[PDB]
Amino acid sequence: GPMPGKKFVARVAEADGKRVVIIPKAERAKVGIKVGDVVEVKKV
Amino acid sequence: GPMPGKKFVARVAEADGKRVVIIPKAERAKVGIKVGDVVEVKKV
């Protein structure tokens, strides 16, 4: 896959009562995310 | 609120067919996230 440490920008949303960052397929491809992967979320 | 640029570690999950990072209340308090806020997600 891609090298770790790539990032993308997103917005916190509500879904099923939870506060979530929804990750689109294209962003998963760009930064190499699969379900189960550890990520870091940083407030901007 | 807190200064921007704080971060926390999480795992990508599936919820309602979407790939999401679920943000618990305590992590929202630590990094100062509200619904609607812009964040950066980085693969580790």
Numbering used by the authors:
A (entry chain A), B (entry chain A): 1 to 44
Paper lines:
Here, we study fold transition between distinct β-barrels by protein engineering and structural biology technique. The DZBB fold is not found in any modern protein, although its structure shares similarities with RIFT and OB. Furthermore, the reconstructed OB fold could also be converted to the four-stranded SH3 fold by a simple circular permutation. Thus, these ancient β-barrel folds (DPBB, RIFT, OB, and SH3) could be readily interconverted by a few feasible mutations through the missing-link fold, DZBB, indicating their significantly close evolutionary relationships.
E The remodeling of the loop connecting β1-β2 in design-2 resulted in the RIFT-fold protein, design-3. CD experiments demonstrated that design-3 and design-5 were partially folded, and design-3 formed well-diffracting crystals. Thus, the short In/Del at the 1st loop position is the determinant for the fold transition between DZBB and RIFT. A single deletion in the DZBB sequence converted it into the RIFT fold. Most DNA molecules did not migrate from the well when mixed with the proteins with the stable DZBB fold (design-2, -18, and -19) and RIFT fold (design-3 and -4), indicating that these proteins formed large aggregates with dsDNA.
